[PDB]
Amino acid sequence: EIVLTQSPSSLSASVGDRVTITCRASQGIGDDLGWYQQKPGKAPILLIYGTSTLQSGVPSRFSGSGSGTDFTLTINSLQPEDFATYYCLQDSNYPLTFGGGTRLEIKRTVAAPSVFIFPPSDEQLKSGTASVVCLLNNFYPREAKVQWKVDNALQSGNSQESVTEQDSKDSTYSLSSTLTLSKADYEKHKVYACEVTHQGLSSPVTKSFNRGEC
């Protein structure tokens, strides 16, 4: 199959900027490449086909170029509705293949997260499992580092992260990190700590709590 390498996987931009998105084919595909746009919860919409030919109804600020191996989608004067995920699709041969995708999000001023830590409730503990929750509230950019420490032992493979969509009013993100333990494993340790590294913090921030002091 033909692999389309899409770049970048995420892209920050301001309204009015000119945006460039690239797709490299593992082999020649001629002019048989198009660009789709997709918004959360909705079906993808074909923006461009045949490398450069624009679909009807699509604004003229979307344009496409390419040789036979490297292709580019360019968005002039970025508009608020243009923030979405973009996919490149080749159909020169079968199977049809898409690129990894480019999430295009809006740039804003750097905003540090507000960090909070939540212990497991006793009602969940009575069921045999303990979920410890670390919350990063209203920050930008999206990239952040969350490390769990249990009696200063760094945890790995026992936590899941969840990120909200970019907020429609202040353009920030929020993140939850849930550390999962057995009740026995939870009660054999004392101090549960969450350290957050983010560009908006002059130094990493630690929120912790102490079993038996909570």
Binding site: Y94, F116, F118, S121, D122, Q124, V133, S174
Partner: protein, 215 residues
């Protein structure tokens, strides 16, 4: 107009047939495609059928298991999916070579063998103590171990919406979904104002109200 139908919860190894009703054009003179999109992943082409149904192509990940077909007098595309795996969980669109809005297919008997639908357990997220200096505190509800999607969460019966963040659900190792819904409130209000989360899970007809306190 293309309308997909037939999606639903299915157990692994079983089968399911999706339909794609076409309207507003000559369905007999155009090839048709099935495309799918797994959660948090990019689009993946599944199958193609020619206008007269003579030529069929599949993706190798579904070859031997999926079968694409069509009826040009009823203007309907069909996808028969056999021996479904967990990786086949996706939203499925049909497209004319205009897309439909898709139908969701979820493979995984998670929940249990004889009650796939499972309601969630709601647990309070509350700080250990009221933080001094910090003027803002956070509260929440952890909605854990339910199947299938989705759940909705309101706060104070909808009277509290500002500052609420209800995270997208994650798929746990057990095959059950879990998320958290949080809210930022003034620290002076902590311990005096009431903060109740309202969780609704219509697949299991579950409606749970949970007050958030430290105990």
């Amino acid at each position: 107009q293309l309308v997909e139908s037939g999606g639903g919860v299915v157990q692994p190894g079983r089968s399911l047939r999706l339909s794609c009703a076409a309207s507003g054009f000559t369905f007999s003179s155009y090839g048709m495609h099935w495309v799918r999109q797994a959660p948090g992943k990019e689009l993946e082409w599944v199958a193609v059928i020619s206008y007269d149904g003579s030529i069929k192509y599949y993706a190798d990940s579904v070859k031997g298991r999926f079968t694409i077909s069509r009826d040009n007098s009823k203007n309907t595309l069909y996808l028969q999916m056999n021996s479904l795996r967990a990786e086949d969980t996706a939203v499925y669109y049909c497209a004319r070579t205009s897309w439909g809005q898709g139908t969701t297919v979820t493979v995984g008997g998670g929940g249990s063998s004889s009650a796939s639908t499972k309601g969630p357990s709601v647990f309070p997220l509350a700080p250990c103590s009221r933080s001094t200096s910090e003027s803002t505190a956070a509260l929440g509800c952890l909605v854990k171990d339910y199947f299938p999607e989705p759940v909705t969460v309101s706060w104070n019966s909808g009277a509290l919406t500002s500052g609420v963040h209800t995270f997208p659900a994650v798929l746990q190792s057990s095959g059950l979904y879990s998320l958290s819904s949080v809210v930022t409130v003034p620290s002076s209000s902590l311990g005096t104002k009431t903060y109740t989360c309202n969780v609704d899970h219509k697949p299991s007809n579950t409606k749970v109200d949970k007050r958030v306190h430290h105990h």
